Write a protein that binds this DNA or RNA. Structure first.
Ligand SMILES: Nc1ncnc2c1ncn2[C@H]1C[C@H](O)[C@@H](COP(=O)(O)CP(=O)(O)OP(=O)(O)O)O1
Ligand SMILES: [Mg+2]
Ligand SMILES: [Mg+2]
Ligand SMILES: [Mn+2]
Ligand SMILES: [Mn+2]
Ligand SMILES: [Mn+2]
Ligand code: NA
Ligand code: NA
Ligand code: NA
Length: 327
DNA sequence: GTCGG
DNA sequence: GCTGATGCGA
DNA sequence: CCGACTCGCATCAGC
């Protein structure tokens, strides 16, 4: 549906193969960087040489593009799709909690299908049992309309705990996406700063409240600053119950909000791009701060930030609306 | 797999 | 039973 | 040529 969708689809499938089967994370990132830069290219690619002009597209990817443009397919991908071990590992990783290591371990023991997981559920940990339970739901997209209803529940229940919590839905939702893969929530409270003593139960109070009104249905991981779990909109009068959804909550110091919003909003590739430019400009950006870089390349103190645009200003970038960060 | 060095 | 090692999602 | 490309949380192997 995009200018170079056939090429970027091929590159994404090759990326997932290198992550799930080969366990070569830098190849996975290399394919993703190539797909992202091609996705931003304003012309329809006619040759591998044309794509090779783009940063991140090298000899082999340009060669794969020429084959795909000539034959409409890739022999390398067709061999992968046919390899029983490769496609089995590739499938098992679609279960949340089953990564490349567990997928390879299961497949070696003849555990390679969904029904194999159900039959061998005793060998799954709690996370994997949940990922298997909601396997279909977790692959459904969340229409933005439903994200607004979820945002209403989250922000309202959070206010019910304490008036001074601030909850901001980030991720693809804040980037204006018509559909989202999950709900990502950033949480702050005046009592938690970078200079304050650990106030526990700050995130626990919010998670407990969302559980009490039956919004959060299951927990995958839960600590003092990060919650990973499952949520579900309420359904009306025995009508079609909603699909269960993944939700992430991150509690960050209030004085590092805007660096947190910038990171949590994404995209992941955009963050990689922005942080790469920051180093070319004498700064280093992470999830919490932007710091200067000295003559020796050492990181200074966190710089003052009171807006997302403040971070763009430091590295001398034109401000990008969250809508234009989906890279 | 790519690119800078 | 505890500690270090490792996998997981992001 | 070749080396570069973060963390909180859950679990469990190895004592
Ligand atoms: N591999 C990674 N490691 C660390 N941080 C990462 C990350 N990938 C993404 N992020 C950051 C930026 C995302 O906006 C934000 C959410 O990451 P995410 O997994 O929720 C993907 P998102 O951009 O929200 O779209 P969608 O598929 O859910 O509709 O977290
Ligand atoms: Mg042009
Ligand atoms: Mg249910
Ligand atoms: Mn079977
Ligand atoms: Mn998300
Ligand atoms: Mn998320
Ligand atoms: Na690699
Ligand atoms: Na190139
Ligand atoms: Na998985």
């Amino acid at each position: 549906e995009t200018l170079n969708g056939g090429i970027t689809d091929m590159l994404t499938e090759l990326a997932n193969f290198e992550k799930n089967v080969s366990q070569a994370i830098h190849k996975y990132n290399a394919y993703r960087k190539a797909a992202s830069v091609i996705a931003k290219y304003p012309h329809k690619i006619k040759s591998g040489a044309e794509a090779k002009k783009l940063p991140g597209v090298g000899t082999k990817i340009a060669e794969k593009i020429d084959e795909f443009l000539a034959t409409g397919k890739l022999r390398k991908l067709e061999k992968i799709r046919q390899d029983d071990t490769s496609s089995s590992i590739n499938f098992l990783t679609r279960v949340s909690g089953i990564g490349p290591s567990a997928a390879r371990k299961f497949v070696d023991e003849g555990i390679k299908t969904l029904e194999d997981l159900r039959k061998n559920e005793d060998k799954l940990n709690h996370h994997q049992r949940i990922g298997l339970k909601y396997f279909g739901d977790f692959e459904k997209r969340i229409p933005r309309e439903e994200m607004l209803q979820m945002q209403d529940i989250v922000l309202n229940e959070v206010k019910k705990v304490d008036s001074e919590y601030i909850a901001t839905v980030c991720g693809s939702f804040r980037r204006g996406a018509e559909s989202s893969g999950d709900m990502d929530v950033l949480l702050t409270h005046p009592s938690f700063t970078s200079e304050s003593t650990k106030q526990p139960k700050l995130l626990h109070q919010v998670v407990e409240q969302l559980q009490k009104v039956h919004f959060i249905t299951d927990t995958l991981s839960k600590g003092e600053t990060k919650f990973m779990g499952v949520c579900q909109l309420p359904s009306k009068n025995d009508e079609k119950e909603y699909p269960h959804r993944r939700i992430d909550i991150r509690l960050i110091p209030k004085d590092q909000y805007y660096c947190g919003v910038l990171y949590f909003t994404g995209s992941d590739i955009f963050n990689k791009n922005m942080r790469a430019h920051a180093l070319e400009k004498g700064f280093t950006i992470n999830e919490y701060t932007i710091r200067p870089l000295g003559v020796t390349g050492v990181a200074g103190e966190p710089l003052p930030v009171d807006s997302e645009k403040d971070i763009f200003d430091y590295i001398q970038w034109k401000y990008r609306e969250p809508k234009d960060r989906s890279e």
